[PDB]
Design a protein around this ligand. Sequence first.
Ligand SMILES: Nc1nc2c([nH]c(=O)n2[C@H]2C[C@H](O)[C@@H](COP(=O)(O)OP(=O)(O)OP(=O)(O)O)O2)c(=O)[nH]1
Ligand SMILES: Nc1nc2c([nH]c(=O)n2[C@H]2C[C@H](O)[C@@H](COP(=O)(O)O)O2)c(=O)[nH]1
Ligand SMILES: [Mg+2]
Length: 293
Amino acid sequence: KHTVRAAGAVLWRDAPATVEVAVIHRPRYDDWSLPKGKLDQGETEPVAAAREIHEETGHTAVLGRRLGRVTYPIPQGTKRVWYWAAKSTGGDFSPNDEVDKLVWLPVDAAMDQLQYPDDRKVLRRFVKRPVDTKTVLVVRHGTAGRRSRYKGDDRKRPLDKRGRAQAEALVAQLMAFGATTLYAADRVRCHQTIEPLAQELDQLIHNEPLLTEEAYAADHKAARKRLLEIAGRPGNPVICTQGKVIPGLIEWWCERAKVRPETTGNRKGSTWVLSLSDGELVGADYLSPPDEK
Ligand SMILES: Nc1nc2c([nH]c(=O)n2[C@H]2C[C@H](O)[C@@H](COP(=O)(O)OP(=O)(O)OP(=O)(O)O)O2)c(=O)[nH]1
Ligand SMILES: Nc1nc2c([nH]c(=O)n2[C@H]2C[C@H](O)[C@@H](COP(=O)(O)O)O2)c(=O)[nH]1
Ligand SMILES: [Mg+2]
């Protein structure tokens, strides 16, 4: 009942029935499996997936759609693994004592190579939908204290200490999915959330008056329109906004596209990873704040 948290991936490259996937061998278990490992202190599942892919296969990669969760018993209690689709961005495997072989296989043959039922289940998920996706990241701003007694939402109220720390932690989280462009509702706490990422990308953050809670409540259709407008642009946008805005936009998009989120929440510092194939939503993955389970 203690949970050892881990992440990994179906790492792929071009040759759905075209694509090749990576399967690894480990001497210590003499198993064939998917690359993965334990979260380090301070790490989120996406950040650990990318790191473990790199350490185990030599490859950098961009994460896309989440492919569900697997659990199994270990002496410390229960092993929990979240898996992502990850597109290789290059690298070269070198055999070692931890992982001594890596084979790239079409899905077909990878299904037969993978010895664990739960890995085959993940690979079944992977082929269920397109994997060459682009990504919209919708982020609820970090912790910023408590609303004041006044009407409206306190335009200038800043992130608190914990929130500033969530902002910093979100850089590696959002980079894992290849974020390229930045957008924030017209509130200071929304900008401050994505400022560390802005510095890292050396990028400017677009301001979004249409996506504040006041504007969403006065004209929800214009917010929706704007979201699609941004999603349509080239690149992988981060859009940081507020708690009364996100659930409505995410539900609206999921319903119209018949996409079922596997997890749901709306915490401050959380991220929805919205995977698109040819402008259609194919996944909506809720990621917890970086400082929460
Ligand atoms: N990779 C993998 N191993 C599994 C699965 N199911 C399962 O019982 N095992 C076994 C193989 C080992 O006997 C035992 C521990 O393996 P592990 O891969 O979870 O643990 P680890 O700490 O050595 O490796 P890691 O999590 O750091 O990558 O669990 C599975 O779905 N995937
Ligand atoms: N190497 C190895 N393969 C296994 C085990 N259990 C299991 O079903 N397999 C499957 C995966 C592959 O389809 C096949 C590979 O065998 P070799 O690695 O010995 O060639 O056997 C095991 O403990 N070790
Ligand atoms: Mg491992």
